[PDB]
Structure 1
Amino acid sequence: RMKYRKQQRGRLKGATKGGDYVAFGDYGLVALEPAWITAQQIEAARVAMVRHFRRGGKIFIRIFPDKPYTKKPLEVRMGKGKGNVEGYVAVVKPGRVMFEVAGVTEEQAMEALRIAGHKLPIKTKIVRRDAYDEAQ
């Protein structure tokens, strides 16, 4: 994971929709019904992919290790300053533009994702480049 040299301790909780979509290579994994996702799990996929792909030609990225999740205590009784930092991860909720390359050229990439996310943690879908995009 990576949410290094943060700045604060913790966030809060909500969820509902955002701004992920594009393309960025044509080997895409897009979420759909999630929320936050373990930076770890994340790396999981990272691995899954990386390894499948004859183990070399790079994939890309997508979301980030974003926030700090806290179960606070360890199992006590509740009233801590709610302190304790512990699990860091992504906050993606409306089918998000999760972008992963390599040069698989195929349903091979497919598999890669297949497992990566099948795994990961939600109802989600995948594809390629479908309606470009024009900027300034």
Structure 2
Amino acid sequence: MLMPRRMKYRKQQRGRLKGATKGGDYVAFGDYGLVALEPAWITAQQIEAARVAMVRHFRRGGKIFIRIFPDKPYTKKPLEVRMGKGKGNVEGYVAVVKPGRVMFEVAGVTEEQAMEALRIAGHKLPIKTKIVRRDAYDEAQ
């Protein structure tokens, strides 16, 4: 999958999901990008499932830029166990994405391709998405 190589703490509280995006709202790298429209924990297996979908659509071509990173520990208690006895074990890792974050984005591929490519990856994600392309993203001078 995709996950941190080291850590200071193996497990962490759940935290909340209010707010916009904090950052990562403009294209920055490629020509097109997939933006999140709802709050959600995107799991490593979801990210992978999307990325492969990408590389799979446009076989041998362009560059894909995964911009979200699963570094937050997802926990789960053993099958059929009661409440108590301490915190559960790490089942996987997630990426906390809030409305507006540009999760993925492609480069070096025909427009038509960028579309169907990003559309598919959307389906793999557990939230509503929107495709876009460089615009007022030139945050400069």
Q: Given that residues 73 and 80 in structure 1 are in contact (C-alpha distance below 8 angstroms), is that contact kept between their aligned partners in structure 2? A: no
Which whole-Å CA distance do the structure 2 matches of 1:127 and 1:5 have between them?
36
* CA separation of 1:14 and 1:28: change in aligned 2, threshold 3 A: closer
Question: Residues 76-118 of structure 1: CA distance to partner in whole angstroms, max 9, x if unpaired?
Answer: 1111311311121111111211232242212211111111112
- Equivalenced residue count is 136
Partner secondary structure for residue 116 of structure 2: helix
List alignment gaps of at least 5 residues for structure 2: 1-5
CA RMSD of aligned residues (A): 3.9
Q: After alignment, is 39-48 or 92-101 more displaced?
A: 92-101
Cα deviation, residue 58, structure 1: 2.2
Q: Given that residues 76 and 91 in structure 2 are in contact (C-alpha distance below 8 angstroms), is that contact kept between their aligned partners in structure 1? A: yes
Partner secondary structure for residue 100 of structure 1: strand
* CA separation of 1:132 and 1:13: change in aligned 2, threshold 3 A: closer
Which whole-Å CA distance do the structure 2 matches of 1:10 and 1:96 have between them?
18
Question: Residues 20-51 of structure 1: CA distance to partner in whole angstroms, max 9, x if unpaired?
Answer: 33432112111110311111110010100011
Which whole-Å CA distance do the structure 1 matches of 2:78 and 2:93 have between them?
16
* CA separation of 1:114 and 1:48: change in aligned 2, threshold 3 A: same
Q: After alignment, is 120-129 or 5-14 more displaced?
A: 5-14
Structure with more of its chain in strand, by fraction: 2
Alignment correspondent of 2:45: 40
Cα deviation, residue 69, structure 1: 0.7
Q: After alignment, is 74-83 or 43-52 more displaced?
A: 74-83
Cα deviation, residue 18, structure 1: 5.2
1:20 aligns with 2:33: no
TM-score (norm 1): 0.79
Which whole-Å CA distance do the structure 2 matches of 1:3 and 1:40 have between them?
23
Q: After alignment, is 3-12 or 74-83 more displaced?
A: 3-12
* CA separation of 1:112 and 1:17: change in aligned 2, threshold 3 A: same
Indicate the percent of aligned positions where both proteins have the same amino acid: 100
* CA separation of 1:133 and 1:30: change in aligned 2, threshold 3 A: same
Which whole-Å CA distance do the structure 1 matches of 2:36 and 2:8 have between them?
20
* CA separation of 1:57 and 1:22: change in aligned 2, threshold 3 A: closer
List alignment gaps of at least 5 residues for structure 1: none
Which whole-Å CA distance do the structure 2 matches of 1:8 and 1:123 have between them?
26
